[PDB]
Scaffold this active site. Structure first.
Site, PDB file in Angstrom:
ATOM      1  N   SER A   1      -6.478 -10.015  -8.960  1.00 14.62           N
ATOM      2  CA  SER A   1      -5.541  -8.936  -9.247  1.00 14.62           C
ATOM      3  C   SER A   1      -4.297  -9.375 -10.008  1.00 14.62           C
ATOM      4  O   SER A   1      -3.654  -8.528 -10.636  1.00 14.62           O
ATOM      5  CB  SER A   1      -5.103  -8.263  -7.942  1.00 14.62           C
TER       6      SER A   1
ATOM      7  N   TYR B   1      -3.556 -16.069 -12.645  1.00 13.49           N
ATOM      8  CA  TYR B   1      -4.691 -16.746 -13.261  1.00 13.49           C
ATOM      9  C   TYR B   1      -6.011 -16.070 -12.923  1.00 13.49           C
ATOM     10  O   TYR B   1      -6.922 -16.048 -13.757  1.00 13.49           O
ATOM     11  CB  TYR B   1      -4.723 -18.212 -12.816  1.00 13.49           C
TER      12      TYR B   1
ATOM     13  N   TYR C   1       3.645 -31.508  -4.525  1.00  8.78           N
ATOM     14  CA  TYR C   1       2.284 -31.220  -4.962  1.00  8.78           C
ATOM     15  C   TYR C   1       1.398 -32.457  -5.042  1.00  8.78           C
ATOM     16  O   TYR C   1       0.191 -32.351  -4.801  1.00  8.78           O
ATOM     17  CB  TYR C   1       2.319 -30.506  -6.314  1.00  8.78           C
TER      18      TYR C   1
ATOM     19  N   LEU D   1      -7.370 -18.002  -5.051  1.00  6.48           N
ATOM     20  CA  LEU D   1      -6.595 -17.452  -3.948  1.00  6.48           C
ATOM     21  C   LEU D   1      -5.293 -18.220  -3.783  1.00  6.48           C
ATOM     22  O   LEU D   1      -5.285 -19.454  -3.788  1.00  6.48           O
ATOM     23  CB  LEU D   1      -7.384 -17.509  -2.638  1.00  6.48           C
ATOM     24  N   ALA D   2      -4.198 -17.479  -3.630  1.00  3.05           N
ATOM     25  CA  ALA D   2      -2.908 -18.040  -3.245  1.00  3.05           C
ATOM     26  C   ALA D   2      -2.347 -17.159  -2.139  1.00  3.05           C
ATOM     27  O   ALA D   2      -2.017 -15.992  -2.378  1.00  3.05           O
ATOM     28  CB  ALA D   2      -1.948 -18.114  -4.432  1.00  3.05           C
TER      29      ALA D   2
ATOM     30  N   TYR E   1      -2.858 -26.885  -9.191  1.00  2.00           N
ATOM     31  CA  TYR E   1      -1.758 -27.454  -9.954  1.00  2.00           C
ATOM     32  C   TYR E   1      -1.477 -28.853  -9.435  1.00  2.00           C
ATOM     33  O   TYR E   1      -1.441 -29.075  -8.221  1.00  2.00           O
ATOM     34  CB  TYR E   1      -0.493 -26.593  -9.834  1.00  2.00           C
TER      35      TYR E   1
ATOM     36  N   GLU F   1      -4.156  -6.083  -2.019  1.00  2.00           N
ATOM     37  CA  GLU F   1      -3.048  -5.393  -2.663  1.00  2.00           C
ATOM     38  C   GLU F   1      -2.766  -4.090  -1.930  1.00  2.00           C
ATOM     39  O   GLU F   1      -3.595  -3.587  -1.168  1.00  2.00           O
ATOM     40  CB  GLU F   1      -3.351  -5.126  -4.146  1.00  2.00           C
TER      41      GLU F   1
END
Ligand SMILES: NC(=O)C1=CN([C@@H]2O[C@H](COP(=O)(O)OP(=O)(O)OC[C@H]3O[C@@H](n4cnc5c(N)ncnc54)[C@H](O)[C@@H]3O)[C@@H](O)[C@H]2O)C=CC1
Length: 405
Positions: A56, A59, A241, A145-146, A231, A81
């Protein structure tokens, strides 16, 4: 009259979060990404039946657009959402997906979406049913997914991810986008529980469950492909990270992909890759003070070299060069790299030099904070060309072929 059901939607920021979104602007943003893909041209030998998990925004949305309008693929999307309603605009990801369905249908492309918790077994079962009824099988699975939390599909435990270093506390410089002041703060080292929780949320277990629920269903084609976006960055962000709690999660990804490639490469020569993408503005960027300052500096440096780009440019190249082309960018561990322009030594050295000179006085002379703010507002559909932001709009935008979980 219908003015009672419509409203003029404007940006409202609470807690470094824009809590509104503009349906017309979100539609214009999606069309801008579609127009980029079509102007760049088709992509040969891409998948034709694609599942995008996290489809949605950001990326994942770019991957859906690339797959659909670049490779001509039928796309099944999964996201989480909030629909709009009277007086209450929905989330940008809802309006983005509404626009995607509209434009996909105009081009005669299949577009179905599922709205619900992708970490749950129920949503995996609905996705499986959708593939069985409509597509038969999918050729490609994009895992994008985040989330800050994950409810375990078996135990019900709620894991929360942490953005913290490991070993020693660290002094991180950052930019407060509400006050527009440069500021530093100390983050404490993550506990073992915080690390395990971040691995559980942002690691590769759920990606593995998806592939293994689809395989025993069974709805993956021969030569099927799957990739997860991540990332790595460079030194400025490495305390988090590379070596931080999120670094522990990305170390998990690096090993779970090995099991996925093994299973797919026996299944018609399929393939699986962790794909490393460059830093971009997302809805949550302003909530981590480090990223607004890093992105503002990175944007200026890369714009001066002609290498600045956003989600759709990154992912179009990932598809054209690495996922479907013969210019693959493998690294020592076996990751696909599309972040090389961000990691160029001269860019990082220049971002680092500026990182130590920026103050409240020179923000607009040393950084592209202007560009950061514009792109951030663009995420929610604000500041887009051709949109009349004075006109009333009905926030209750509906989506055909939207499965509500
Ligand atoms: N933002 C960045 O700078 C970079 C991000 N990435 C990676 O790209 C991937 C995509 O994340 P981003 O685009 O950053 O942010 P994002 O917030 O733009 O997208 C997150 C997506 O996941 C969906 N989602 C979240 N929780 C869900 C749930 N429980 N069930 C179903 N759908 C859910 C959202 O609806 C949305 O479609 C991530 O794996 C991230 O690590 C890689 C490189 C850089």
């Amino acid at each position: 009259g219908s003015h009672m059901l419509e409203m003029i939607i404007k940006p409202r920021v609470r807690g470094f979060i824009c809590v509104t979104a503009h349906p017309t602007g979100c539609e214009a943003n999606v069309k801008k990404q579609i127009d980029y893909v079509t102007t760049e041209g088709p992509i040969a030998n891409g998948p034709k039946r694609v599942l995008v998990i996290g489809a949605s925004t950001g990326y994942g949305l770019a991957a859906r657009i690339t797959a659909a309008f670049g490779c001509g693929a039928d796309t099944l999307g999964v996201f989480f959402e909030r629909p709009g309603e009277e007086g209450k605009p929905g989330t940008s990801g809802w309006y983005n997906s509404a626009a995607f369905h509209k434009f996909a249908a105009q081009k005669g492309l299949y577009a179905k979406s599922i709205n619900g918790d992708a970490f749950s077994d129920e949503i995996k079962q609905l996705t499986i049913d959708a593939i069985k009824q409509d597509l038969g099988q999918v050729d490609q699975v994009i895992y994008s997914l985040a989330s800050p939390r994950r409810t375990h599909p078996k135990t019900g435990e709620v894991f929360n991810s942490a953005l913290k270093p490991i070993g020693n506390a660290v002094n991180l410089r950052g930019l407060d986008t509400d006050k527009e002041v440069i500021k530093e703060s100390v983050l404490q080292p993550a506990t073992q529980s915080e690390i395990d929780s971040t691995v559980a949320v942002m690691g590769g277990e759920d990606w593995q469950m998806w592939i293994d629920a689809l395989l025993d269903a069974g709805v993956l084609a021969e030569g099927a492909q799957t990739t997860a976006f991540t990332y790595l960055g460079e030194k400025i962000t490495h305390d988090i990270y590379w070596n931080g709690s999120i670094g522990a999660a990305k170390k998990d990804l690096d090993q779970k992909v090995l099991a996925i490639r093994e299973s797919l490469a026996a299944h018609g020569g399929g393939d699986a890759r962790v794909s490393v993408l460059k830093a971009v503005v997302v809805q949550a960027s302003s909530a981590i003070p480090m990223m607004p300052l890093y992105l503002s500096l990175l944007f200026k440096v890369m714009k001066e070299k002609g290498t600045h780009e956003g989600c759709i440019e990154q992912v179009y190249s990932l598809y054209k060069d690495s996922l479907c082309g013969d210019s693959p960018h493998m690294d020592q561990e076996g990751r696909l790299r599309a972040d090389y322009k961000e990691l160029d030594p001269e860019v990082q050295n220049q971002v680092q030099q500026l990182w130590d000179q920026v103050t409240n006085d020179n923000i607009y002379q040393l950084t592209d904070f202007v560009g950061y703010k514009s792109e951030f507002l663009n995420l929610f559909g604000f500041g887009i060309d051709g949109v009349d932001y004075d006109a009333d709009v009905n926030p209750d935008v509906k989506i055909p072929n939207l499965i509500q979980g």
